[PDB]
Amino acid sequence: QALKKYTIDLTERAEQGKLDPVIGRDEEIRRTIQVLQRRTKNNPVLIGEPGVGKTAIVEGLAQRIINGEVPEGLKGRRVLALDMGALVAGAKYRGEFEERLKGVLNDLAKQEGNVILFIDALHTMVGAGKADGAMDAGNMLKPALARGELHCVGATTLDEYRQYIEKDAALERRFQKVFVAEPSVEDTIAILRGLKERYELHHHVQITDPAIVAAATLSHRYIADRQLPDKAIDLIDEAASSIRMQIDSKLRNKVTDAEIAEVLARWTGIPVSRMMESEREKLLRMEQELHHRVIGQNEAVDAVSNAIRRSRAGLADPNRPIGSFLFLGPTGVGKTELCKALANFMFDSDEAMVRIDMSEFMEKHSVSRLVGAPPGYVGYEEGGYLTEAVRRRPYSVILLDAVEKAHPDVFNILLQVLDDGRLTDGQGRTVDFRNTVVIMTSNLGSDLIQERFGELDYAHMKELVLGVVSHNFRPEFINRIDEVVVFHPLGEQHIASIAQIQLKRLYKRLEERGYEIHISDEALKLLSENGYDPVYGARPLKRAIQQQIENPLAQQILSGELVPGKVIRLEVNEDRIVAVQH
Template sequence: MMTPEAEEVFGNAVDEAQRRRNEYLCVEHVLYALTQELSGSEIIQACGGNLEKLRELLDLFFRQELESLPEGEPLHLQQTPGLERMMRSAFMHTEASGKPLVDTSDMLAAILELEDSHAAYFLTKMGISRLDVLRYISHGLTKSAGGQSLPVLRGSSTPGQPDDLDEEDDDFDELDEDLDEDEESASSGRDKRSSRSALETFAVSLTKRAMEGKIDPLIGREDELRRTIRVLCRRKKNNPVFVGEPGTGKTALAEGLALLLYAAARGNARQRVPEQLRRAEVFALDVSGMLAGAKFRGDFEQRIKAVISEVRQRGNVILFIDEIHMLVGAGSTSESSIDASTILKPALASGELRCIGSTTYEDYKNHFEKDHGLSRRFQKIDLKEPSAEETYKILKGLRARYEEHHGIRFTDGALRSAADLAARHINDRFLPDKAIDLIDEAAAGVRIEGVSGRKTVRSGDIETVVAEFAGIPARSISSSDKERLARLDGELRETIFGQDEAITQLTRAIRRSRAGLGGPTKPVGCFLFTGPTGVGKTEVARQLAQVLGNHFSRYDMSEYMEKHAVSRLIGAPPGYVGFDQGGLLVDDIRRNPYTVLLLDEIEKAHPDMFNILLQVMDSACLTDNMGRKADFRNVVLVMTSNAGAREMAASSIGFTSMTDDSGHKGMKALEKVLSPEFRNRLDAIITFNPLPMEVMLRIVDKFIRQLNGQLAERNVTLTLTAEARTRLAERGFDPKFGARPLARVIAQDIETPLADEILFGRLERGGVVVVDLGTGDRAFRFRFE
């Protein structure tokens, strides 16, 4: 089966043979038809062919080599064996390439396989090879873009020349000479076009983009720009490389240089650009594009050399290679160690090629710096992350571009909030990129939602986008959280009973931190909760996260009693299983920078855990085994400990208040567990008191409210009599375990009987249950209303 275009070509070939009264339909008729069909003629021209000259050769061949039957004699057209071989080859090529139908390109490639045919000879004389056709079919590469042309066939000694071609024929000699002259001129023309075409194919002119107004202005970076110009003006090794974190403006600096050179060429900014650079043109080279489609050995090297050749010819070209570390190893194979960097090194060292590279610190260290021959030919220029104030100036400089694109306006407060909040809350990216993304997305959101026809982006819009970016509640973003901090004490007292003194110390420490009186490089707070078990230490941390609107993470330190287990938090050392997976704690804080972090029962952890926590409490930073940093500046660190509980209980038995003597004994016990440097980094050591009976009654009420919330789904309501409430408090309290047994008592004595009634008894359709004191072995009895 053939495509409509291929069928049309074959039909035209038949028509041409019949028009000329030829007895045989041959390959040359098909080639002649290809020169008249759009797709076929396009391929021939793209591969360097001359359609007019090719038609002249074929016409001469038809007149001199093929016999024409007289008029009136019956014509029975027959296919030559060569045509049959050509069609079989075309079908095989189509099947091998996975295409369903034969098209004109397959027919042309099949013609070039018939080396003993006149058609293949004519194409070869024009410098067209089967490889050229395949390159164009597969990758759209023209002969000029693909590099130098293959050797052409000349004279009777050329392999593949038909034996029956009469070279002594005057007409053929004349055409052959013309064809050779055209070929030589075309070859030289292709040599000139090949470099130009290679640069245009694999690079983008930043100067042209600057002329078209498609490049944003460069704000700041004056020192780096001056150093770049100074390096480019050197006699040798005049190649700067920009090294910085992703998003700090490496590509923007190269585009800013193109803008400056374009302005100098027009007569502006001449005092900032030396004479030798005023006519320079900046091209951004696409290394991945050069690698694409280079499946044959030598293709990639040929493209690199073509680019270098044109840069040398033009003389005033500056190449910008983004992600320049990709040059190391690019194009090398198992059989050859030659890569792109090896090809570039001579031109880079001599000063013939001026090149600007950009890469990150990690890639510079891992790839670029290891190739000493390449790195010494470049001059390193560091691009540090700008401050929030510098980012604000950059945003003001870009404001007009984004206002024009979105059709809205930005307030100064919105730009200030974008710079400040991006620096404060988005910790896994870098300024100014993350701040620019904030204003861009906020503007898109305002424009799409069309809030009451508003055409202005305000600080509140930026805060909403930051909340989505950082994965935290929107209310945590607000620059003023006075209201939330003001009600923090009261909301904690509503859910935590009997620990008023501990709650007061906790809220005071958090308010000091939020007021800016704490260290700027420390967590929000570092607290140690001590006291008997079951008195609410863990629950305070959980409720604190809920009130602040922060993420809550709990780590049980009993899982980190061994030395090797501690490495799970920051990642395994090199050579161990899981080295490339990072650390649990570092990953957790990187994902949730606003977290209440609870380290439960810290005294059970291995001593190495305390060494890790020292840097967290001191510098609010933790680095994993892969060099990634987690920022703890917005983390509330809470550690609980039962150390000293036994000593405190020795002088405080029953439901009496803890005395000063017992508290002193508890602190003495903590000093044996925690080192002085660890204790000195804590904001507060908060001691929790044992629970008195009146507090236990309030805890019973809390548990019953929670149970009623679950029963509401079944339309069941539960109430307690005063006697049953007191009995639950007595049965649920243990001096050694605090309020922990209460949950078990409620589950066994209340929830278990109710479950049977809900599933099989009187509460299948809902109802009201009153719990009262029981008699005999039953602690409680139930009345159903």
Template sequence: MVSRQKMFCVVAATSSLAAAFLTVPRLGCSASRTNFPGVHRTTFRAAADGMEGMESVGPVMAAAAFLFSLSAVVLGNSRRSSSSSSSGPNLASIMSSSNLTGVAHATPCTSRWPQRHSTARSAMVFERFSERSIKAVVLAQTEAQRIKQDHVGTEMMVVGLLAEGSGGAKALQALGVRLEEARRELERMVGFGQGGKSKEIPFTTSARQVLEDSVECARERDTQQVNTCHLLRALLRQVESNGCKLLAKVLATDSQQVLRERVLAALAQQESTESTGEKVLGGAARPAIEDEVDLTQTLKYGTDLTEAAREGRLDPLVGRHEELRRTIRILGRRTKNNPVLVGEAGVGKTSIALGLAQLIADGKVPLNLKDKRVVQLDLALLLAGTRYRGDFEERLRAVVKEVTDSKRRVILVVDEVHTLVGAGSGGGDTGGGMDAANLLKPALARGELQCIGATTLDEYRKYIERDPALERRFQPVTVPEPTEEESVQILKGLAPKYEKHHQLSYTTEALEASVKLSCQFIADRYLPDKAIDVMDEAGSKVRQQLFQAVEETQNAAEQWAAGRELEEVTAQKARAAREERYEEAAELKRKEKDLAERLERLRQASAEGSDSQGLVKELQSLGAKIREAVTAERFVEAQELKARETQVAEILQKQGGVPSEATLVRQVTAEDVAQVVSSWTGIAVEQVSASESSRLLHLEKELHETIIGQDEAVRSVARALRRARAGLRNPQRPMAGFCFCGPTGVGKTALCKTLSSTFFGSEDSMIRLDMSEFMEKHTVSKLIGAPPGYVGYSDGGTLTEAVRRRPYSLVLFDEVEKAHPDVFNILLQLLDDGRLTDSRGRVVSFANTLVVMTSNIGSRSVQKSAAGGLGLGFGVGEDEEEDKYSKVKELVNEEMKSFFRPEFLNRLDEIIVFRPLKEEDVRAIAEVEFKKVLARLADKDLEVTLLQSFKEQVIREGYDPAYGARPLRRAITRMLEDTLAEHLLQSAAESWKGTKAVQLSASEKGEVHVEVLDSQPAEPKSEPEPKVLEEATATS
């Protein structure tokens, strides 16, 4: 490698060599003509490229220019040799690509640079420029190419400064100037041209003047370099330039004096935080704040969040001021300056790191963080492709070296930081290699590497805390779940991003509903993540509905147009046939067939989608009726239908005709959010409609269709469900907690099944637990899950897992008195707080469940009353019966108090004592059961008539006050179902085609008689004729 001093000594000894290059064709230098050790031919070729346009200058100036060009190329090569890559263009690349010739070739030329010596003078000017300043100039040229302009003006230089991001850009960012905003203003100011195709775009007179003045600014401030701050100061001197006008537009000021004062004040503040000096070509190396940081390997496995923030690609951080301040405070420490954000999944830990990157990009951080770059490291990319031992360690060490060499100017962000433990060790604790955590420990302890981690509480406890050496290198910052009010503000801050994505708007009520409903009904996730997901899906849902509405209406319009065209073609065909123009009539007939097929396809597509609006449907039906009337030559009717069709079409036209997606309402409402939450959880959280309101008000009537003789129980349950649906209950407790007491067979379980089907949507919504399975002490853990180390730990609890999967359901604890007493300790928490914690530490919410327990306690007292011991039964007045029933309830409550603990009974909303069934109740139940059986038989095309004698016999055999309705079901099974089954099988055995109607009756002795009302023998299968059989045989 050739040092700079050696290169200058060798080349300066023969300055006449430059003149010889003027006669050599471009790129004509070769290694055979040179005798410079260590200098490759491509180096001379690159230097010769910098000599373009120098034929008109003298040998002395040519020698100077060539020497400078050659030195720049060699220095650029030496820099590239010492580092794998540079993050921006350096001076050598600028010279070799002839980017500076644009300065010399610009017309008209009125600057102080002589036209003849413009290239040499430009080289002398750019000799004083720092690499970041040159990068800003090149980015200005890139911006000119982007908007297809054939020159680089001061307005492009403003954008170039902002895109470069240091020095002057930070001063502008402190005033609120953003790159994207400046680009938009630039596009409005100059627009898009037709040029920009050439790589050598010249500078305007004002731009060249800015470049010259920047050197003067550097000299005035006694510095040897021209940095981006000097460029901005020089630009402010051109008061009437487009660059100043662009800044004035962005900063919303009309006074150039005010603009100049504001920018100079920001520049003074920025320059006070930066150290002067930089590595200047041709001068001594001095430390500088604008030195390039080589992060080739780091960015290969990560993302520069600071750059993404400057480009506006990050979501804004709303709130979290205390956590952000603590993170910045920890980063400012001398050692162990590594915060780790600890909180539950979805509370916004990573967003804090993104918010820090945004603050650094905006320059709104303390001085010690002003020049930091926040890079998010992806461990998955680091591990990908590491097939052999040592590959991962080599990659990670390269990243660590780049970060430590940056002298604490890079902050690494590692999401899920607990994955550092064991990563890359080839098998965790037994892999035999060092994991990522051990590789990072030394640099973390010395403070050479700054890292922001993020992990959950459980993972921090499991992975980080168990390694004290790693834990002491991090400082935890607890990130709690935000409140509902804070979450609403977060959603309001994020709403513009989602509105831009979905191309619609969110109402304030929708954002508030996203937080409120997700907090109330989605218990296993955390704010604001679950609210953001609900808001996002609601926007997607509305956008999908808009598309479907447009597609549906356009389909209807196409049907109407096709119908009108088909009508015209049909009329033309009929007219051509009458006038004996048969060829034309045949052509019209083919066209009519094509149109009819097209219309049918459109109708099928419309049928597959959702229903159209009423007017569109009417328009379609009118078109079909008109065609029928014309075909049948009912012209008067067709005329009337056409008049109605015209009227409907005019109404549609007044309403806007066929809407496009752009004309439909683009707004997400609270109702849309409620529908999304309902689809997620299965919980009816939408606003109560008129039909549902009417159904809830008359819920008792609906329940009485299947539950007979239990008025008190039905009323109590209906009141609880109305409270829950109206939103007046305590949202932290279950909808209600009931205990159904009474003898067997009176409808306790049947009422639960009816509730699950009518209110919760399906009988499958009932979670039934037979408490006889929990009689032993060790079976109690089955409800919430086995403890660690026991069989079934990973399966979860029988109760908790069922409610986690179906949070909107009825939970039935059948025959609860049979459970072990320890079970009631779990039920205490369930009934009072509406939540249980399973064996894995997960909290399960019972807030959307209806808890019902059934018990046979007190059944003897009820049976005794039914038998007449307390006067309850037949032959007793209604008032007297109610008095006796009240006494029975008191007896049952006393027995409940003697069996259950007071704290358990006190948590129940109501203890409902079911009445014993009377004979008239059994008759009504029998009618319900008969209807169910007859409905099943009707599905088999069998009509059954039950005579009154048969019904009476079934009721006599099925009524038993001590056992309720269960004997009745057994009697129906034996006398009705078994009898019909035997009859159907006998009919099939006797080759009858099948009975269509059957009548059942019973004799006085209780014998069941079956009478067939309509039947016929089955037709025998005909044998194939011999001839046909022979033909079939021959064919085979």
């Protein structure tokens, strides 16, 4: 009949057992039954945020009907998953949709109060038969709803509920709101323990139950895209397919929690991966790798090494971010170099990061540049720069440079940030900063540091510059810092080592060009004499390397003088540096 054409019996499928076991949801199914045994407006609607198991509530109710675990008034009923695409499709003629829907309604009256109706996507039922001068499904179902003589069950997302049903109050009051919350962690672990049998029967592999509880735990903590139980189910399924292809292509036979971590790190790259000996010996050689690019300035290397080790070691403060820092020193001591060193350690690249230089924000209102603009105003549909740049890749490094340049009340934003890792952009959603490192640099007591780094300890220098910082900032803000570090002007040996590093990357780029070039150490001594001052550090070394290398060497390369394969000693002139061809 017409019920055969447009409806699908879920209860016959659960009678075949071809539906999923549904475990839990007891108050939700009980209130759904309480609404379904009424006199007027029998119709519960499963308002719940997208992917918390709303279809599975009705499927589990169908299974409880088949098992006979319902009250006596529901024993022997039929749940029919109504189809909207079956009804819209065949009707470009006038009245043909209304013909079908009225025939369905007369069949449902004919079934004598035995058919439970399930309508997935109730928001699809709203704009259903919207042809020019045509009733939708609302204008035809709406009689039989509030006489109680239809046993509809809605299932809709809450954002679809606002736009598509709360806009139409008449059909909005015909139903009964059933909030279906995202489950907490422990109950989701229980549900996943229920569903282990299905995936074991599907992929013929086994699952570690610690991997299950780790998938639920890490999914609730780190992934902010989807919602429970959906994200954890997808973790388990994708791990199962990965193990199946590891076996079948070319080891193991189960699904460990390390496989869960590999799935999560493949999905984003938050380094939940366990400390393998390459990674763990890398992490124990933290300061050694930081002094592969940054000579000197030991104490901040120590502090950030400590913070990243406490992050990776499973001792993360789960609400504050990784490290809430503050760098302080005179101009040109490689503060940005240390930040690029962290980026290169973490991501194998300097500019795989976000640097936002706060000298651009010397006015107040650029707060709205990084957090966005409210509803109504100009740049609403774009988001703040900082929030979006986190919202793509949350495991990153957020760098603020020249923090003395901006207005003091930009730093209520970072009060939020360093309190909880939370930030709310102009559209009004939270952005998790629990995988970020915040570094702020200034040159506050640079006169005081250049004056008194000699003949003083590190500690009371930090004390005195902290007093200067309290003269600068707010007591709220500097409480949020994990650790304030102090930089110092470098000796000439540090600048000679930096010149060695610049010669290393120069010879790297000239082997890329294809030239075997060496240097006299006297030329290194002359370059150390040239770009040196205690007041400015190595940016004079930058310009000295720039001029006295990049001008004559590249001038003689383009002069046809430098032949590849020749030994090229960068020896000295009387006042300059000369290359040879030997």
